Design a protein around this ligand. Sequence first.
Ligand SMILES: [Cl-]
Ligand code: NA
Length: 301
Amino acid sequence: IVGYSQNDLTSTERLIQLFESWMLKHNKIYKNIDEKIYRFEIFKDNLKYIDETNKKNNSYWLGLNVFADMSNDEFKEKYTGSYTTTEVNIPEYVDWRQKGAVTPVKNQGSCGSAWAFSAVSTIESIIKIRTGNLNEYSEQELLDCDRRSYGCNGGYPWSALQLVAQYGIHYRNTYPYEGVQRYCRSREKGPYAAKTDGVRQVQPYNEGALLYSIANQPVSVVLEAAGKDFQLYRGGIFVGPCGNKVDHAVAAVGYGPNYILIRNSWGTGWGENGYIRIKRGTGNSYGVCGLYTSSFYPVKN
Ligand SMILES: [Cl-]
Ligand code: NA
């Protein structure tokens, strides 16, 4: 499903009703009417692009997902959705969701905080893996408190992970997400909920290395997410196009023969209920969309 029937494309009235329908599906309410008209125009143009691109025989398809009313210029201006990131025998299949080690898909909103979401996801997972309990921890805390990062203007998964190793992290409910950087309120919220024992880097530009890490636990990884095809991604195995100018952090929560399974922080209305399967095995040392550029995971004894 791509969000529309071809009958929807046969007149301006149907297109409009389709847009109306899509707004409802995604709980979109606009500032004023001039906004709604502008949004319909963008929506119409992305639909044309979606329709023409899905005609071709590619291994993935696009769709009227949650970003269908945004121009790529707008989507890409902060780079990364709603510069999130700045500068031996393993199973055939791995999927940590199946082991109860992955929390429900989150939404970073209009804040370039994916570095924190990426880090928190891997911490949530390794604490489950080590202790048996799946908890939700605070992205907001890392957003506010990681002094090496830049809040909603982007940051570093490795710094966020280091903070949790050295100090700790509070529960989500204790320090909920606001999508805006405020002052660090860690000390106000009492004792930490969890604390890891360190951080490791996967050897970069090495697919086998990353797969091995994923087989042991979810891994924080980065990729170039700013492209229009990535923005409008609906499902299937993503082969590109994308360059190596990584700009966004995500979590690698699994893999299969042909892909790496990627947890994004753009909510469930993007991609495969929040996930994307990125092509692997192309021999290309960068990885597709530069996926092998910079990967870190938490250590928990
Ligand atoms: Cl690439
Ligand atoms: Na690529």
